[PDB]
Amino acid sequence: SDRVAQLTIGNSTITTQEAANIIVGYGEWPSYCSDDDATAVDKPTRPDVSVNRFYTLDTKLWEKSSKGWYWKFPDVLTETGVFGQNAQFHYLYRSGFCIHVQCNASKFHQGALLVAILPEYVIGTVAGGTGTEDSHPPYKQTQPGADGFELQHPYVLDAGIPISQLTVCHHQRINLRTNNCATIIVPYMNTLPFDSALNHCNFGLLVVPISPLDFDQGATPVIPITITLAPMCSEFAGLRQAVTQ
Amino acid sequence: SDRVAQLTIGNSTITTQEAANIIVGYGEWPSYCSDDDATAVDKPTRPDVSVNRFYTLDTKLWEKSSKGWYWKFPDVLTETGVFGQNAQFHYLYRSGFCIHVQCNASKFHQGALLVAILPEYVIGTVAGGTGTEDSHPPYKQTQPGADGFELQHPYVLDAGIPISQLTVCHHQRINLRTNNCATIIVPYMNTLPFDSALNHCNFGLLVVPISPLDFDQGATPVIPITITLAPMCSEFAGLRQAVTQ
Amino acid sequence: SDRVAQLTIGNSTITTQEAANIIVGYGEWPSYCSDDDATAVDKPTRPDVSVNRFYTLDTKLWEKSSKGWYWKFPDVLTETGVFGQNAQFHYLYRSGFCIHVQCNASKFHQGALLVAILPEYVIGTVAGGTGTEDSHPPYKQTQPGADGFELQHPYVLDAGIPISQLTVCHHQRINLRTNNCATIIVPYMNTLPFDSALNHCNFGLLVVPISPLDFDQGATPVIPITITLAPMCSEFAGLRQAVTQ
Amino acid sequence: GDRVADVIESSIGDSVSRALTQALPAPTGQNTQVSSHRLDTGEVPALQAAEIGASSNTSDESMIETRCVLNSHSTAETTLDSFFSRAGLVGEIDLPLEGTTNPNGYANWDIDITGYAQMRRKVELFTYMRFDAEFTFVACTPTGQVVPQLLQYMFVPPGAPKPESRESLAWQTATNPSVFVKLTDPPAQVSVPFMSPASAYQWFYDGYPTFGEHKQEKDLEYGACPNNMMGTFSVRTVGSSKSKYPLVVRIYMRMKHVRAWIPRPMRNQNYLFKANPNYAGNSIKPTGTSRSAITTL
Amino acid sequence: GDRVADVIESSIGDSVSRALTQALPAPTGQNTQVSSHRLDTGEVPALQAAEIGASSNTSDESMIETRCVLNSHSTAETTLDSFFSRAGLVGEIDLPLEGTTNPNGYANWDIDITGYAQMRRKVELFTYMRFDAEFTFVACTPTGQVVPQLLQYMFVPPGAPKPESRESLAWQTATNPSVFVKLTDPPAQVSVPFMSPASAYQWFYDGYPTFGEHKQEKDLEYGACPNNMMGTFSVRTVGSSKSKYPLVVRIYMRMKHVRAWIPRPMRNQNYLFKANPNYAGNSIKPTGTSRSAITTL
Amino acid sequence: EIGASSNTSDESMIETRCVLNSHSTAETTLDSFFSRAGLVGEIDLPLEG
Amino acid sequence: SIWYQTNYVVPIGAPNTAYIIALAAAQKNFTMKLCKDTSHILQTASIQ
Amino acid sequence: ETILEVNNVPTNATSLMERLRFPVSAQAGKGELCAVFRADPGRDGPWQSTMLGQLCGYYTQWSGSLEVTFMFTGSFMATGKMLIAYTPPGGPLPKDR
């Protein structure tokens, strides 16, 4: 009644038998842009099923020596399917998301992952270590795509802010003795009603082990983490040639 | 009241001051697929403004020694814009069209073009000339794209059928002393409610000079013919990877 | 219905077969001075037909190397007919105007003229070129009469103000492939209800080619521009001897 | 539910076909009405603009002084039933004893009615035609002699096994339809339905059936519609041994309950192949007869 | 109009935001109710599932035997007005005579309130904040001495010309707002509106403002939002000649009519730069104090 | 050539949506544009010169 | 951008070249905000 | 409507009136480019000549749709068709039609 879930959107369907629940972000479900909030006058295209569907990015391995990974939205879908063509062919973009993270393990495995949504996850750097260099992150760290990027210092989230207060955003846990899926539903969060998908990323998705993975020699040592995500209430406006960046 | 026309669909707009009228093909305007005529059960995507808009292919030159040109639909838009991505990403396709052909000349120029829509314009070949070889046309003649293909024997339309009876299909004339645009609106014509856009072409578009172009030495000798066309009531169904052919 | 016009005022009549429309200036038709706006107590003379009638000044030639011409109102009619005697014999003056500019050319001629009404068209000078001399224009440049004066620097209108923003006043175009007449109706524009006609000029009339005249060798190379103008709702007050300046 | 105004005021999903024309009854030819002389301006019905792509709406009442003619000429013989419900040769199967054609006593015929020019040019006036049919098999010797022989006419749909011989196992017709006849009988005559997975057959198919690269090898596939491959006609001499009579089976098809769409230009060049609109490019013949000059007859 | 059923039964264009929660009034802290002992099965309010990502809904009435407490403790001092409507240092401008800082008598200050850690860490608790403000300028000598000098505080919005000198033409303030004050007067205090082209300022911007390739040259642009570049503050000594007093202008901003969205983790590391969430990676300090062992204090 | 400006809107050139504008024209008035003090004069009163 | 669609066709005797005058304005939904001083015109000092 | 100085190439006084009209001539029929300019009024370019581009200097933020009107100043006998494309942001300068 609460540990089982089927998520159907589009031509896609996820099953889970070992769920917790669904987190609906900031108590707002995704919606479409009202005529009061809108400023642009062009008619937006609303492709219902060709972009609002579950996309599967890649698979990270939870090892003992893991530190964490982050993915930036909507950068993860700007080279993938029909979404990443409407987003390149258009200038404006608006959508929510349903993120769904998968990690399966046995009943003889232990560990926990914090799966959180951090809006406007701006990436800082070590500043040379001494704090004198005003270094900056390259493009393959702020918009790393579907491959994601490995956190160097996950205590401060590579932004000088503590991981411990990160439950103030959306989150779930994947505790392997309780659940193997983490489902968060995110609305469109920005000061503007639409924005560019290639220049601006609305939020980040952190997957950090707070408790480390452990097992005894003989069990399956490959414990994959798979990110699977669906746009929701997508909208595109301002059509011109396809530019990638 | 009848020589002036503005065609607005999408983010696109054509003006003409020297028109004839609009031909609505077989007295049917384009429509969407009804639930009685439908057989496939997936929900189709209906992107209103991102694919139903005027696309401009290329420009053919009307010389003295011209014979004619043909273009195959929807092959002309399978590498162009958002239409040619939804059509590659999907398996099924349904649309009407508004074709609009442009040829400008002076009042001291004379000539006529037959601008016609031939459904299922199957391309035959000279059969070796003697009729013994069972030759076949290559792929760059049956699906030539936006570049179109130059008719070898336009009397028989390279299919053994006379040009003279081609007014039984849709047509307009571009008589340079009367008009410079030719506007035809075509519905979806097939035995099936949907079909593939890459394998099957619904109709062809013939542009043939019946009366040859003539001018005296000093006038503008470059008389271009430009094809400009808009999908109408487009529909796509059956989503998978993008395949081009 | 809109390209044909007959302007009848007085004993005078203009025909045009190739007009655009009539511009009524600042949405005010000419009127007579109300008793609330009036301050002078003498009874004004209102000669209906002897001064409100079309007067034809002179004829400027549109050459290739033209720059523009201006005429100052009411200075153009202070030596002409019954208007230019009532205006000399009286001290005060109030009138609107209907200006009408004529330029005829063939259908094988091309060019455009901006025909505009600039209120209080104060004439500046080049200031020695270096800007150190505080030079001033002579009387035969600020009040040049019916002969008009040829602009030296029509980009700045010989006043340091750009020609490009001159459509913010009244204007028409004479595009030779569309029209050959330009009709503007101007009310009395001043801070005062009456004023002197010899000392103060209410507005100027600019005729500037934006697009230059061109024709091929054999066509009529003399393309004249003729100014033809009618007072409207004229009024004169304060009678004494006739003084010219 | 729909909230934004561009979605409420949308014509998306309008499935109803908006037609400009309407079919009215015309059981007879149109009658001529009385006309008199016209000597005014503005109303000029003889002048047209053919660049519109329409046909002239000018009648003879407006070009000459006409009388009243009450027409009773019927348009009933121009219908598609009356034009196509006429049996014609669509197939011919030879069953000889010695030679190469079919020397074993069985013959399979891939059903296509595009091997005889007189019925093909009638159907290729349209691109889509939907109909039920009535096939008739006139069997005889080369000389036309009727002989005492039993045959079996098996319909082999697509997917079903074709017989590799006369002694074959496919001939048991447990599920495929069959007709047994003696040559001494009237010709076998069976009615067939519309059996396409589509809504109509199609004589012209501008496309390929398969995906993939299209090189010179698989160029035969251009034009081939599997919706028209209705299967195979098979015939044998019912017997375990060799027959003694040569045979010919001629097939005659009559359409009924006809519907057609999208008329085309009619074939003016001689056909050359089956399901191929090829022509002889060196010997292109004009559509009709010629003259010595344009001012003569 | 809509005809097909998938379009009539569609949730496309539902602009109304569906909210799960509702804001209720809480002028006081919640009162405690009387509780007794519980000795049943099934009802177990102490056990939670923190993997859900929610917080515990367990109260003290269910964990201990409690009394009635009628609370009258107000939640009025935790509002965003009461937390942010408190003037703090956001800027400091030095106007010396000799040196390098500003030796000519004018100083331009690009408005950013991220140069002082005590007001920055208060705003970076949120990612979006919309407010009107009240700026206050406390001018004085280095020693704190109030001196008889006239100044001009010009607001230079973006696009307007910045003054290149004290004798400049931008100082005529015909359209830009300005404030003239003597140092002997109370500090100038002006109210400012919400002046963003967006619906709220944003202290964190995960993105670039410009399109194109993003190499190591234009990596400064990471994080820069032009919606927060509200322009320039300019100050001069009103005079054609050189002043005789050194000067300092200190700027204090007080927010009013505050709205905020999307709380974040609070900064635990020392800031280093302006509008840059960089940190010293070698000297990463823990968020709080440490121990010798976990069983001691 | 009429001398008027175009009466063409974006509803007639593209497929547009509904936009309920609440952008005020109050800051373009002549009060708001001119009720802003600016330098119109400067008088010098020296001792020598 | 402005592109030639077909061509500029002209008869013999007429000139082979013309010119286009562009005229720019704003629409009824246009507003401006946050009055300031102008930047794209400046004055060399010493007026009069 | 005020004149937009698209052909803002000449600078000498002899040829400053040439900035108010830009040419269109006979081409080879390859979909060639005539002119390209930015749709930015406050940006230093063609719109500086307009009353919009000068009253926008006195304001910091603008909103709303614009309007560009092109007039053909050729012969009555001259014909032609042109494509006037507005490319929204992100889109670089199109290399072809």
Ligand SMILES: CCCCCCCCCCCCC/C=C/[C@H](O)[C@H](N)CO
């Ligand atoms: C004893 C039973 C025999 C019955 C055999 C009847 C066969 C039914 C087929 C009738 C339909 C023929 C339609 C043919 C279409 C064209 O040949 C194709 N488009 C090939 O070009």
Ligand SMILES: CCCCCCCCCCCCC/C=C/[C@H](O)[C@H](N)CO
């Ligand atoms: C004499 C008039 C002086 C008035 C000057 C008032 C300036 C108004 C600006 C107030 C708004 C400040 C918002 C600043 C935001 C952050 O600094 C940016 N995100 C930069 O990081």
